[PDB]
Amino acid sequence: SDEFDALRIKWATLLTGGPALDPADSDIAARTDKLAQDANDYWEDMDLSSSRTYIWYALRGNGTSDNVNAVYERLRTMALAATTVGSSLYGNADLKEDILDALDWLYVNSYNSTRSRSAYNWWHWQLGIPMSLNDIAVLLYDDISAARMATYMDTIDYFTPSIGLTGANRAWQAIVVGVRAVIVKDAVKLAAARNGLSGTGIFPYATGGDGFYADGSFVQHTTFAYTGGYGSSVLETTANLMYLLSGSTWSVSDPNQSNVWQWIYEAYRPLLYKGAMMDMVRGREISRSYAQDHAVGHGIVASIVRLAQFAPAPHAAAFKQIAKRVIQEDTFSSFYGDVSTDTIRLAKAIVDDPSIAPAAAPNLYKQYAAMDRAVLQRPGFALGLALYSTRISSYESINSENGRGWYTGAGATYLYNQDLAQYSEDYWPTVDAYRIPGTTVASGTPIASGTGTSSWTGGVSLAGQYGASGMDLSYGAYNLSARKSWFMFDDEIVALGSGISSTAGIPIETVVDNRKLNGAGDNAWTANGAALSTGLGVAQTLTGVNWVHLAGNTADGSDIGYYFPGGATLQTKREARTGTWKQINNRPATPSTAVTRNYETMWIDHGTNPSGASYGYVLLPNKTSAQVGAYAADPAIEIVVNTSGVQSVKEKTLGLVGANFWTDTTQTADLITSNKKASVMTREIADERLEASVSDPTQANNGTIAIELARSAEGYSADPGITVTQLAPTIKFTVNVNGAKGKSFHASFQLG
Numbered sequence: 001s002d003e004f005d006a007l008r009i010k011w012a013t014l015l016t017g018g019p020a021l022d023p024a025d026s027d028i029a030a031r032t033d034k035l036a037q038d039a040n041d042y043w044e045d046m047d048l049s050s051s052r053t054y055i056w057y058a059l060r061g062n063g064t065s066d067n068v069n070a071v072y073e074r075l076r077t078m079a080l081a082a083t084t085v086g087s088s089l090y091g092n093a094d095l096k097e098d099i100l101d102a103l104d105w106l107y108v109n110s111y112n113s114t115r116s117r118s119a120y121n122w123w124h125w126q127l128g129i130p131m132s133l134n135d136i137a138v139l140l141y142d143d144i145s146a147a148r149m150a151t152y153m154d155t156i157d158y159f160t161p162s163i164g165l166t167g168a169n170r171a172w173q174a175i176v177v178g179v180r181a182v183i184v185k186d187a188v189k190l191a192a193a194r195n196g197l198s199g200t201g202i203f204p205y206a207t208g209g210d211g212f213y214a215d216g217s218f219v220q221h222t223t224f225a226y227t228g229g230y231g232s233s234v235l236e237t238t239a240n241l242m243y244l245l246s247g248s249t250w251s252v253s254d255p256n257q258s259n260v261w262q263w264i265y266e267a268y269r270p271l272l273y274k275g276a277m278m279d280m281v282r283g284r285e286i287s288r289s290y291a292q293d294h295a296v297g298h299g300i301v302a303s304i305v306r307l308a309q310f311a312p313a314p315h316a317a318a319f320k321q322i323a324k325r326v327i328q329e330d331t332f333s334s335f336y337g338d339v340s341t342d343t344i345r346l347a348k349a350i351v352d353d354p355s356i357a358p359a360a361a362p363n364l365y366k367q368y369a370a371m372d373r374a375v376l377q378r379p380g381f382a383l384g385l386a387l388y389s390t391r392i393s394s395y396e397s398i399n400s401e402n403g404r405g406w407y408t409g410a411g412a413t414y415l416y417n418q419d420l421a422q423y424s425e426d427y428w429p430t431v432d433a434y435r436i437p438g439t440t441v442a443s444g445t446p447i448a449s450g451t452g453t454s455s456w457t458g459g460v461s462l463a464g465q466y467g468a469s470g471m472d473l474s475y476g477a478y479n480l481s482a483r484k485s486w487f488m489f490d491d492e493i494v495a496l497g498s499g500i501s502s503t504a505g506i507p508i509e510t511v512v513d514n515r516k517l518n519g520a521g522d523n524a525w526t527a528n529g530a531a532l533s534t535g536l537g538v539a540q541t542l543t544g545v546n547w548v549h550l551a552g553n554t555a556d557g558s559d560i561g562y563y564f565p566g567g568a569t570l571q572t573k574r575e576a577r578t579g580t581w582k583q584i585n586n587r588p589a590t591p592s593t594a595v596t597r598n599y600e601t602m603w604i605d606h607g608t609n610p611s612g613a614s615y616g617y618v619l620l621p622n623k624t625s626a627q628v629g630a631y632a633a634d635p636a637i638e639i640v641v642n643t644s645g646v647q648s649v650k651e652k653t654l655g656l657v658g659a660n661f662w663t664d665t666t667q668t669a670d671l672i673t674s675n676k677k678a679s680v681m682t683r684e685i686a687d688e689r690l691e692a693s694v695s696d697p698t699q700a701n702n703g704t705i706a707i708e709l710a711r712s713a714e715g716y717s718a719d720p721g722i723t724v725t726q727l728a729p730t731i732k733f734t735v736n737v738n739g740a741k742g743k744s745f746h747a748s749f750q751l752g
């Protein structure tokens, strides 16, 4: 028994679930039956004759990365069904030989060192295929002759001989070099893989470019928010590799590995909602039918469970609590339904352990300044806000993926509630891509993929409880500019727009919402107390509307109210939309099956060539018709200002005042006065204390922000970087935002 021999068995168990895997388990049973079934269909119509010019007719083409890569995945699936306890194909020797022969056929006809290491698509040749190959190698290790194993691992070492990329890609090389190292028992290479994790975009926090940021953000491809896309892969790969090496000669020792624990707390947890990984941070992956939010979420929890196996306390235990909660929260799609059998085994051990209680649900506001994202988590609902600027791009679309993601990150609001299916069930291929909720656009007109021209994108966080965000809008593809702000309070979100001007000669609109409805598309809804028609295919204009209520898809926990201060005119339509994933993902493997979903879409029409137009609306999650009606009668919020210079809102019951200042001039909103671009929020406790949070959203101010609060104080306490120069008769202080990178600075004053 070699050490490598031990590692190999360890990895094999990670793939099959080991010999302990209990096939009596209801969920484990399902996972294997499905694996065996899939393995059969593949084996069944597989071309076995030595004359064959392809393995599977439907995948022929020894020069198409996609096809070849897909052929290895299938072989991988077959190898698993032949080594997983409970599988009807377990041990079947014929199946094993067929897999091996197919592998030989590929080495000769398509996968060998005579090909360009950089031949499109490079990813497939250097990472995708090798990862599948190693897995087969490890699973059929005993049945693989030294001769064959040579042609297998030599080719791999050819394409990927070392580690030198960043983020997800560097991690992928690491798992490729490492797993191969264990197979060919090369201690050098293996030590090389372990060290690769300390590289760019992984263990060490990034200050720019790809990687994880100290504020929890995750970037990939230089300018895209990717926590849920490439980020998922980095987490999965890093967890799998760290677990393999853990407790061995090549165990990870880099001190930065502790940042991995923080990833889970600050980078992932806040973006998870009852099993779903928010689409706003999944990039172009939202266009993948096999990777909708809950499916992706399950993958992330699977990694957390993996980390829980070797993570040091208290982390290990905390990870268990978080996984247990999410597994119990997701009643939409079973967690055990789409993760590895080993994950199921390990997960069940946590859920059935009574000594382990579910973690508390997150309740907070967080500003992901490095990736122009913000998230609000409350009991009963979550709000995700996607923005873009000179630092982050509008959306990514490469390799024929995400062709209609134009506005998915242009001041887009994503509401999460009891309807856990809202963004799954083919939302993306059917939703009107020109009307993404919360955005302001030129009707039916797209924009390009790229960074913006304004740096004012971000917001402030008040003690991680409340917050405000803003985005200076100016599209490049066409003339349209506006100031958009969002104020997040306890149970309402206030959206404000001003300075909406255009010369594009195209109608401009602001999408209040665009929700997928139930199967019948008959959700009930009211306006100003009047029941509205619920028939599909009906468009209608609601004039002089103060409030609207829309019943959700669940009995409770998914209703949404809309309040319009000062009244508004809404353009609406309830229609059935048809689409195909092929339309937004034009790759071979995408199903071209048509699907139909129902929608209720509501927008404000600003007319053509508007000048200084504006809007204001409040989202009231989980309230009944009556409640929304009551609210509109005696609103808790109050619009302090909504000009192109400053947008401010007040929350009378909580004593909160938020303000976004758009220009570098002295301006005043309620009790707040600022001399520069800033996002400010204050909380006043009658004759007790006054709290304030300030941030420089532009991340370009090399000096200070001078703030003045119209209140008299007796004393203070503040974050370093703040200098109070006066407490009476009014409060005055400056904030050193030089190199702050969009962070919030807090100060607390004792009132007379």
Ligand SMILES: OC[C@H]1O[C@@H](O)[C@@H](O)[C@@H](O)[C@@H]1O
Pocket (backbone or CB within 6 Å): 123, 128, 233
């Ligand atoms: O499509 C091949 C491969 O490309 C990478 O860039 C990522 O998008 C992966 O998720 C994907 O599997």
